[PDB]
Design a protein around this ligand. Structure first.
Ligand SMILES: Cc1cc2nc3c(=O)[nH]c(=O)nc-3n(C[C@H](O)[C@H](O)[C@H](O)COP(=O)(O)O)c2cc1C
Ligand SMILES: Cc1cc2nc3c(=O)[nH]c(=O)nc-3n(C[C@H](O)[C@H](O)[C@H](O)COP(=O)(O)O)c2cc1C
Ligand SMILES: O=C(O)[C@@H]1CC=CC2=Nc3ccccc3N[C@H]21
Lengths: 203, 202
């Protein structure tokens, strides 16, 4: 299909919960053959307010938010511990859609972290265990050699404590869909206690 | 070809990270990357809540990345309040990311004019009609107003709220995917006066 004028009937009649709409949009993105729809630009900040960002491919979406895995000792992991707030942005060129998810990243339980680790491959385990994500790389060949050593053992590799999941639980979401006449469709959800309030925005 | 892109600068980094940004953008163009300038721009309000949206940046100069927006938009208010921004490029076709973090500095009025002047007639009409991010009261009315402005059939002046910023990098990261999962990560940071580079673990 085209990158303007996607159908968006929910603009005028929004579901009560934004996660419902998020899942709908993601499912349509798959029908539309969007390339890497789950590539989320995740922004976090340090205590002085300085913002950093990187792509995360999220794992799944449950009824409460967007689940992803990372190293708790990485830059994003340290920032999340410091300040809690995060924002994630999806953008699909093929359909002219963006989704902003702003919330807090809630650490998952250890049992959930284990299940996430078990869902990955042994090569992923080996590089994840060998690398302290975002720390200075001193010796690239040594790192590569250690990941190869771990793989060759053929033993189950334990989950390093830094490998953890978070749930990004939104307090605000925006759904944006391009229009060819430039009056883009913008639907904002904001938490309102146990409910949500929606607004349409000017482009 | 989304893995193991050529990256000699990983081991031999240019003195200025903008140099490498421009090199990568030129290669993205050769590789026919779709919308390579679509930056995920994050900002924050003073209480710490972060927000994000796509911005197609306008240009790059030796001091940073230039973009435009409405000063009264949600991002505009946040930029005024805290100054901090982080922009992220991601090119699926080549397995490359670039992170640009720093202060967004307002441009001068002459630079604002130039940015406005550079845009199209249809862009001007809707940008003049719409108060970006304010509540939309009546869709039909805003459409009609944009069309009326367009119909004036002359060059519309720059609305005062239409402004540019220069994102001046304090730190930049270049990431290139590797088929062996040991992704190439090159970080530049300002350490006092000049740039410190490091390679990072993936
Ligand atoms: C498509 C794509 C998906 C990625 N998914 C993840 C992920 O799920 N978890 C993760 O820790 N890093 C992921 N990364 C790597 C991050 O972009 C980043 O390099 C890393 O998490 C370190 O970020 P930090 O130094 O800002 O903490 C992904 C990168 C790309 C390009
Ligand atoms: C591809 C693309 C390019 C965009 N370029 C800009 C831009 O250069 N400036 C701008 O104000 N909004 C741009 N937008 C719209 C923003 O993503 C956003 O909807 C608008 O700026 C309001 O953001 P805010 O409410 O967070 O302030 C672009 C959107 C898309 C999808
Ligand atoms: O989509 C993927 O597997 C991601 C691609 C690139 C880097 C990644 N790094 C990770 C580090 C920790 C946990 C998950 C990751 N995902 C991949």
């Amino acid at each position: 299909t085209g990158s303007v004028d996607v159908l968006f009937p929910e603009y005028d009649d929004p579901p009560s919960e934004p996660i419902t709409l998020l899942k709908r949009w993601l499912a349509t993105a798959d029908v539309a053959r969007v390339r890497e729809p789950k590539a989320l630009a995740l922004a976090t900040a340090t205590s002085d307010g300085r913002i950093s960002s990187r792509v995360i491919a999220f794992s799944s979406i449950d009824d409460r938010g967007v689940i992803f895995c990372t190293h708790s000792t990485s830059r994003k992991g340290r920032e999340l511990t410091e300040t809690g707030w995060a924002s994630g942005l999806l953008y699909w060129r093929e359909t002219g859609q963006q989704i902003m998810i702003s919330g807090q990243a809630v650490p998952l339980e250890e049992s959930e972290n284990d299940k996430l680790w078990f869902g990955r491959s042994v090569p992923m385990h080996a590089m994840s265990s060998a690398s302290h994500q975002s720390d200075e790389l001193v010796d690239r060949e040594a790192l590569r050699a250690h990941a190869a050593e771990l793989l060759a053992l053929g033993v189950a590799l334990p989950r390093p404590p830094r490998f953890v999941g978070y749930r990004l639980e939104p307090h605000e979401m925006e759904f944006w869909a391009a229009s060819s006449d430039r009056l883009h469709r913008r639907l904002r959800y904001e938490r309102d206690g146990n409910d949500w309030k929606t607004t349409q925005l000017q482009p």
